[PDB]
Design a protein around this ligand. Structure first.
Ligand code: SF4
Ligand code: SF4
Ligand SMILES: [Cl-]
Ligand SMILES: [Cl-]
Lengths: 137, 137
């Protein structure tokens, strides 16, 4: 499962990607209302996207924002989280001699590689882009 | 992220896969001690694996248990959970016109397909199988 935070960050970028140059740099508020979350959640997401350099401005998508891959974004946004936790409160005795762990690393790489060919631009092509714009009508 | 329950079910199968024919059908207890969890957690996992038909017996791996793919097991064990929740407490307005959702479906399929070539047999090949047996020494 992907984090709510990761998905929401992606939603926010999608919303910023449909801004027709010379429409308006959106406020965080407008973004949060349109993508259907509270302000506070959207606020976190935007500040992170600013940390990453994919947004700036009033808010805008950067040169970088348009061209980065969705794979890269998810990798960055997922941050620390791993596919499995081999040492939580009760750490696993197979740690370090685990063939399953290796397989899950390969599987998780397959996941990100399926997303490397896409950009946010590709995600706001139709039908999605129109619906976002539709939601600001 | 994979569920603790899914990983633990896989741990339990791995433990059952190293039983040298005519060693001993393990009790749930022995499995839970060896894979490093409480009895109650292991108990759930085993009953599910019995529902799926990959274990039986005193506990044993079935004919089916040896040959099923790790991909199939994870798909079954993950059950209901989806890659993203497009309708939780605050459902997403992009539902049904979301290019991101489609991409994440492709990504998640890439994840399982990386695991389709493996079986539990492949996971308890070395170094893992020896360590499990080592943990019953
Ligand atoms: S069984 Fe393997 S992947 Fe699962 S927690 Fe243990 S070391 Fe990690
Ligand atoms: S942005 Fe797309 S994938 Fe994310 S919750 Fe909304 S419909 Fe689902
Ligand atoms: Cl490893
Ligand atoms: Cl869909």
């Amino acid at each position: 499962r992907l984090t709510k935070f990761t998905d929401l960050a992606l939603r926010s970028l999608m919303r910023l990607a449909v801004v027709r140059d010379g429409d308006e740099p959106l406020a965080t508020r407008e973004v949060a209302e349109v993508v259907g979350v509270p302000y506070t959640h959207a606020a976190k997401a935007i500040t992170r996207l600013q940390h990453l350099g994919v947004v700036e401005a009033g808010l805008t998508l950067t040169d970088l924002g348009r061209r980065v891959s969705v794979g890269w974004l998810v990798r960055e946004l997922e941050g620390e989280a791993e596919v499995v936790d081999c040492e939580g409160d009760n750490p696993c005795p197979l740690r370090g001699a685990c063939r399953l762990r290796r397989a899950l690393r390969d599987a998780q790489e397959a996941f990100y590689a399926a997303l490397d060919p896409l950009t946010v631009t590709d995600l706001v092509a139709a039908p999605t882009g129109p619906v976002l714009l539709g939601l600001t009508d």
